[PDB]
From a paper:
The multi-domain nonstructural protein 3 ([name]) is the largest protein encoded by the known coronavirus genome and serves as a central component of the viral replication and transcription machinery. [name] can be divided into three parts, including a large N-terminal cytosolic region (~ 157 kDa in [name]-[name]-2 with ten distinct domains) followed by a transmembrane region (~ 20 kDa with three domains) and a C-terminal cytosolic region (~ 41 kDa with two domains). On the other hand, little is known about structures of the transmembrane and C-terminal regions of [name] or their exact function in the viral replication cycle. This part of [name] consists of two transmembrane domains (TM1 and TM2) separated by a luminal ectodomain (3Ecto) and two Y domains (referred to as Y1 and [name]-Y) in the C terminus.
In an effort to understand the role of the [name] Y domains in the coronavirus replication cycle, we have determined the crystal structure of the 286-residue [name]-Y domain of the [name]-[name]-2 [name], the first complete [name]-Y domain structure for any known coronavirus. As a result, a shorter construct (residues 1660–1945) was designed and used for subsequent NMR and X-ray crystallography studies. The structure was determined and refined at a resolution of 2.4 Å by multiple-wavelength anomalous dispersion using data collected from a selenomethionine-substituted crystal. The 2.4 Å-resolution structure reveals that [name]-Y possesses a previously uncharacterized V-shaped fold consisting of three distinct subdomains named Y2, Y3 and Y4. Y4 packs tightly against Y3 and the Y3–Y4 interface is dominated by hydrophobic interactions between H34 of Y3 and H44 and S45 of Y4.
Numbering used by the authors: 1665 to 1945
Write the structure that this text describes.
Amino acid sequence: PTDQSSYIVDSVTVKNGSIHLYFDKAGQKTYERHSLSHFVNLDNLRANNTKGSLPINVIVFDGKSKCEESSAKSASVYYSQLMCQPILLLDQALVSDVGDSAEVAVKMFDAYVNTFSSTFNVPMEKLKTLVATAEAELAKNVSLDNVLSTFISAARQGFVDSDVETKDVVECLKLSHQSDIEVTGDSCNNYMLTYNKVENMTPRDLGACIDCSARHINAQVAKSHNIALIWNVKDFMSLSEQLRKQIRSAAKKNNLPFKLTCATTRQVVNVVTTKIALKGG
């Protein structure tokens, strides 16, 4: 029994700004984890869409309507091929009482605080006051980016280097929570597996790579030396969504750690790595 194209979501559970979607795969109970943010507005997960792409491998439909379910199952034959993964078909009835903007934002913020605390080794007692202010402000409908930025600027003293910008920590936290990416304060390398070829990059992707001095590393040279791919958050974000996903999946294929950093310092080239250049020269 191979990985079909879609699976029906039977049940749902929420905890720490994340949702679990439960399905039966060849008689074994399984789940996929997604950030709660994709479930505030369900329209982005409907098969009709407005762009023709899904932010996650999930299709929301109305289980009360026969056509919506069958249409979504048909649509997931296309998206499964486009995304190179099966699609989870979720009835909108399972995600009725999930959250309410701020309600979900407070769950998000609490997850940001845990990643900030464990990344910069900051004791939770030192943040107690700044967390209380931040949570009472989110309930006042003060933007999450404002509350997060205000929190980081105040909480950063003595834990984050003066060289790193608050905005880069903010993006690291947000992204870390969206795609479950490890965050570090360590020097980046902007190393990329040889699998992601220059020939298949767009001018924006090749140029962005050359701009951040991205280097190519061979999968085996990286595996045997236990090399982690550490990208600067800004540099990584200058890349396309497709390229960002490809770099990460290639690292996961070879069991290589993938991390985002808020640091701008580069780690010393101690391994045989070739700088990404234009196909000609």
